[PDB]
Write a protein that binds this DNA or RNA. Structure first.
Lengths: 166, 229, 37, 167, 123, 338
RNA sequence: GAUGGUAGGAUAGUGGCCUACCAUGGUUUCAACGGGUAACGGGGAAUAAGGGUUCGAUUCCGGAGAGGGAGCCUGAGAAACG
RNA sequence: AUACAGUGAAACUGCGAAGGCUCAUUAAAUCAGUUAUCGUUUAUUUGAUAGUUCCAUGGUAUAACUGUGGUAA
């Protein structure tokens, strides 16, 4: 990154003759670490005293949350199909916040068969993924700042809310 | 290089003493060197005021706090062991720090304006003041700008003065800094020039802010003693 | 489409490199009789 | 060339100015760590084996173990550009360091037949081999700290309970 | 009321109150509008000062351009040249503000490059 | 003596592996060869030294001098890179993951320009000096280094292109698209000449061609896919091909020839985990180079038998083959240690 | 990026601060935007002096620089006079 | 004072220097006050603030130091 200041750009009035200043330390834009899938490597960068910041690049073990009961359990990552904060970001298959990524939902199968007995009330277009294995789930946590991959599962309303999109 | 509040004579020096960090801010306090050395004159220079600070005569707020630039702000009761000196210092009517002499039963406490009440962590009610005494557990009816009375042996609130229409208020801030009389008017606006207004000898009127004013008692009965002329 | 495809002329790259005369070691007739089909 | 030789367990080390470089040419193009024989560096020390351990060349520049390139190169060490000779030994070493790990056929009145002792015995208890009143006071102050703080906290929480009952 | 991706929703339908003498309309307490930066449900909290004036343009959505003429006692040429001010402001689900419409706003948490004020009143 | 992996009656060696007495018999070739936990892309310059390796987090440039066996510098560039080339020595051009293009010099960062859409590949033309940059969509752009203009961008098919390359001895512009068509343009005419279609016999899903290459005879063309299937092509009966399924087959990214050293008609293929090498006119594997981690891409140093990968680990692996050729003049005791 | 909206990146965090997508906005005769110096002078920036009436106390002219641009590192604080 | 015991060159340590010249001309954007940050960082100052235990004390590896040396340095 470069900057965080209004001095390089124009305001709501249209001004000119900028030529302002050598940029300070507190306009610090670090490089955009597009977090991907790999082996888990988090860079421990420093800022503002001992404010360590976890910059995750190759995180896997996503803690994704069963919605209707709120069961955040551990799984892997496959790939993001739709994220128009950059439509090339899904072409390159990175992993950022608020992305809709696919999960092999085998521990969710284990929890359902463990606290319900039988195997398969829950919606049908996610029951198809209960059968097959890959369910859609959206990342909540920030791997570029907190270094973690947490998320929430897609269950019904939010599922169709994304499936009608793409 | 000085402020106005210290009552500092100009024929003193070149470098003015910056107070160190502490309870109060820089702009609303006087350190111990400008207190003892050149106001009530228990010293002649910085060397001997550091000497009596190493001897530890000062007992501000019941603790010793041996430091030259310790920022004694509003009504911190300076206590000196020899000749049982008990000093409550308040504001006069023209902006300076009038240091009134009090007695032991009055210096056994102080009062403090409450700034905010918090549900901070683990269900604990919470109160802060201008010296930052985070004391446990007041009643739920502590609004902003009320007045707690600190214990000064332990830290507990002993008495409480509610801020409402018809209370004796002290103004420390802005162009009303250091006035007493608290009743011509009440006017709470919604973000500025909001206050209770203060009389004069002819009962004139005045405007200030909420945070720049704080209560000291009742209409005729403050349990603080005040100096006179 | 503001910063998208500015068809301007830029200062440091206007003579960043220099061309070559013969270039391809083949001939253009070798191109034509190379991919006639 | 000069050959520094070290017999480590006896604690002996000495340099030997060996001219006549076809004796020296056994070491040539052998990098650090690879062993050697006494047979092609000398005749009077046969059955000898030396692990090489670097050496400063002429112009004094050291070699660090195992890079490449027996000329001088400019690396980044403890980070600034320092000049360092390559680990491989060639014709232009001033001194070359050697560790003798087996005595062969001749005694040496510098290395074998003369030796130095060590420095001094150990100081730590476990190094000599191979408090409890503080354990009283630590535990007592810890249980007293618990019986002060964890009781006083509930002792003003009950005052909160009195304020809540009266409110 | 969902023309964009990424789970358009309140962020924890949801409802709160800034207090301090400003009402919350019943659709803004319980309605289908998201209230992302409208301070009644919102994510922002109120502070600062509150300014009042009529408008000039409400052309783009979530842009309320207030005008604010005010008296100032000019001593230079001893006559009052009349004031004018401008401030962009995000929408609220309480009034489609047209030309005229003296309204007031409270200071909070810079939303775009130049907006710190969001509508809290219409009268 | 460095250990060798098992293969088909042939030996390879790695230097700077994940595993590479050992501390005191270290075999380190290039000092400070390690990045910040991954690697983007490595390539060796046309002259006999100065290899360049792009960065991973706070991405750098990392020029290594081969005649000093260490690092020269690391210009921390502004964004994360995907593709670049080297233009002789000191000049080089890069493009990042955003649609911006950097021009590094001896002083570094001579300019930063942009392309209107997100780009994926860049090549330079030695003849009349226009870099062709392939991006997403209908758009294959030019930035001519003569007069710094822009040129009349090449109209593609729908989705775009994964790789562009021009032929060396005659200039035939390749562009590996998504819909199996290879879209050969002419660097003379600025028009299409052919729209060759790629076929198979398995047809799992509609693969996209990701790697294009030529060599210095100017008659054949090496083609890739998004499935792990190498392809050869000639003008001689250009509709079929010879194909090479690979035993894992995710996405082949680097297919490069051996057209300048001995042991001829041989080619290196490289997908995400493995990089193999086989012979022309039969399609039988000469060797393979299985590392302990995935591969971001590779490169092969000219004149000799050594390979440099960019991977997803902390160091980069170098792979020496003492049967393909010797070790070069700056590594001229690798044949003495192993 | 002009003006705003949605999301992400980076942040110490607010923020078109940067990028994807979308809308064609926004300031102005109630002075936009632009023109220069006794802008080595001015603005209280401050002390005022018991008769000097724009001399007469000071903070700051603007930002930079440690041979020249570039990149990196340290720290509660830095794009370090070391 | 036969495991330490005072002077103390040279080495680790705690800190020191804790704020100094020249050059091209910015019109409330340089500056001064003020509102706010439940929109944020914070060493030091000050007030507060910790409850998971199956069949008498834990490991080599480096200095300083000796010893062999290289180099004009």
């Amino acid at each position: 990154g470069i900057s965080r200041d209004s001095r390089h750009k124009r305001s709501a009035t249209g001004a000119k003759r900028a030529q302002f200043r050598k940029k300070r330390k507190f306009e610090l834009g670090r490089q955009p670490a597009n977090t991907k899938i790999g082996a888990k490597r988090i860079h421990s960068v420093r800022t503002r005293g001992g404010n360590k910041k976890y910059r995750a690049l190759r995180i896997e073990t996503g803690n994704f949350s069963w919605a209707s009961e709120g069961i955040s359990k551990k799984t892997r990552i496959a790939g993001v199909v739709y994220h128009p904060s950059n439509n090339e970001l899904v072409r390159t298959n990175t992993l950022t916040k608020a992305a809709i990524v696919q999960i092999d939902a085998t521990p969710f199968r284990q929890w359902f068969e463990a606290h319900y007995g039988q195997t398969l009330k829950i919606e049908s277009s996610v029951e198809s993924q209960f059968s097959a294995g890959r369910l859609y789930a959206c990342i909540s946590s920030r791997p570029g700042q907190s270094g973690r991959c947490d998320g929430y599962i897609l269950e019904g309303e939010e599922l169709a809310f994304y499936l009608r999109r793409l | 290089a000085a402020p106005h509040h210290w009552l500092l004579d100009k024929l003193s020096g070149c470098y003015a003493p910056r107070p160190s960090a502490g309870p109060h801010k820089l702009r609303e306090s006087l350190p111990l060197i400008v207190f003892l050395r050149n106001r009530l004159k228990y010293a002649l220079n910085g060397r001997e005021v550091k000497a009596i600070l190493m001897q530890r005569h000062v007992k501000v707020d019941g603790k010793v706090r041996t430091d030259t630039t310790y920022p004694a702000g509003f009504m911190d009761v300076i206590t000196l062991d020899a000749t049982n000196e008990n000093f409550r210092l308040v504001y006069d009517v023209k902006g300076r720090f009038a240091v009134h002499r009090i007695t032991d039963e009055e210096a056994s406490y102080k009062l403090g304006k409450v700034k905010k009440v918090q549900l901070g962590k683990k269900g604990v009610p919470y109160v802060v003041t201008h010296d930052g005494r985070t004391i446990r557990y007041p009643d739920p009816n502590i609004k902003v700008n009320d007045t707690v009375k600190i214990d000064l042996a332990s830290g507990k609130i002993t008495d409480f003065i509610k801020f409402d229409a018809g209370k004796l208020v002290y103004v420390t801030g802005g162009r009303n800094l250091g006035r007493i009389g608290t009743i011509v008017h009440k006017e709470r606006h919604d973000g500025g020039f909001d206050l209770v207004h203060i009389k004069d000898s002819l009962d004139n009127t005045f405007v200030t802010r909420l945070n720049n004013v704080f209560v000291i008692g009742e209409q005729g009965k403050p349990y603080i003693s005040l100096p006179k002329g | 489409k503001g910063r998208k495809l500015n068809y301007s002329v830029q200062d440091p790259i206007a003579n960043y490199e220099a061309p070559i005369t013969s270039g391809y070691k083949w001939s253009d007739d070798q191109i034509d009789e190379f991919f006639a089909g | 060339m000069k050959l520094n030789i070290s017999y480590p367990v006896n604690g002996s080390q000495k340099t030997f100015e060996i001219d006549d470089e076809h004796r020296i040419r056994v070491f040539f193009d052998k990098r650090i760590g690879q062993e050697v024989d006494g047979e092609a560096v000398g005749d009077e020390f046969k059955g000898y084996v030396f692990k090489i351990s670097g050496g400063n060349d002429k112009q004094g520049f050291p070699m660090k173990q195992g890079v490449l390139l027996p000329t001088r190169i400019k690396l980044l060490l403890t980070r600034k550009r320092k000049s360092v000779r390559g680990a491989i030994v060639g014709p232009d070493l001033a001194v070359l360091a050697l560790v003798i790990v087996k005595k062969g056929e001749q005694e040496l009145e510098g290395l074998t037949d003369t030796t130095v002792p060590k420095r001094l015995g150990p100081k730590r208890a476990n190094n000599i081999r191979k408090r409890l009143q503080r354990k009283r006071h630590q535990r007592a102050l810890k249980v007293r700290n618990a019986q002060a703080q964890r009781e006083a906290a509930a002792e003003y929480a009950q005052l909160l309970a009195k304020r809540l009952s009266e409110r | 009321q969902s023309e964009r991706a990424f789970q358009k929703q309140p962020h924890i339908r949801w409802y709160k109150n800034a207090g301090l003498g400003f009402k919350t309309p019943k659709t803004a307490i319980e309605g289908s509008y998201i209230d992302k930066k409208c301070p009644f449900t919102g994510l922002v909290s109120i502070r600062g000062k509150i300014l009042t004036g009529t408008v000039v343009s409400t052309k783009m959505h979530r842009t309320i351009v207030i005008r604010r003429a005010y008296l100032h006692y000019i001593p230079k040429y001893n006559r009052y040249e009349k004031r004018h001010k401008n401030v962009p402001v995000h929408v609220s689900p309480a009034f489609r503000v047209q030309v005229g419409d003296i309204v007031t706003v409270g200071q909070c948490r810079p939303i775009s490059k130049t907006v710190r004020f969001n509508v809290v009143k219409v009268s | 003596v460095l250990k060798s992996t098992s293969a088909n009656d042939v030996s390879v060696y790695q230097v700077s592996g994940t595993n590479v007495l050992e501390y005191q018999n270290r075999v380190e070739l290039i000092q400070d060869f390690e990045f910040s936990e991954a690697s983007n892309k490595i390539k060796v310059s046309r002259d006999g030294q100065y290899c360049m390796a792009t960065g991973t987090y706070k991405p750098q440039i990392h020029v290594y001098d081969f005649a000093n066996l260490s690092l020269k510098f690391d210009r921390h560039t502004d964004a994360e890179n995907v593709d670049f080339t080297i233009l002789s020595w000191t000049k080089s051009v890069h493009l990042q993951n955003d649609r911006s293009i950097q021009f590094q010099n001896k002083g570094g960062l001579h300019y930063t320009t942009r392309i209107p859409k997100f780009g994926r590949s860049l090549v330079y033309n030695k003849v009349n000096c226009d870099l062709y940059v392939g991006a997403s969509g209908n758009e294959l752009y030019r930035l001519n280094l003569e007069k710094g203009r822009f040129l009349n961008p090449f109209k593609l098919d729908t989705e775009g292109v994964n790789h562009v390359s021009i032929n060396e001895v005659n200039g035939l512009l390749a562009a590996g698209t998504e819909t199996n068509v290879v879209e050969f343009w002419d660097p003379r005419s600025r028009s299409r000449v052919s729209k060759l279609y790629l076929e198979n016999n398995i047809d799992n899903r509609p693969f996209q061609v990701t790697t294009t290459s030529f060599r210095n005879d100017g008659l054949t063309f090496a083609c890739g896919t998004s499935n792990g299937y190498s392809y050869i092509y000639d003008l001689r009966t250009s509709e079929p091909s010879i194909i090479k399924d690979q035993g894992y087959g995710f996405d082949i990214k680097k297919i490069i020839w051996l057209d300048n050293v001995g042991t001829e008609n041989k080619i290196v293929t490289c997908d995400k985990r493995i990089a193999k090498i086989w012979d022309r006119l039969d399609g039988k594997a000469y060797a393979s180079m299985e590392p302990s981690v995935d591969i971001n891409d590779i490169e092969h140093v000219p004149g000799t038998g050594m390979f440099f990968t960019a991977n997803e680990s902390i160091p980069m692996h170098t792979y020496y083959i003492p049967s393909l050729g010797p070790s070069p003049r700056w590594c001229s005791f690798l044949d003495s240690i192993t």
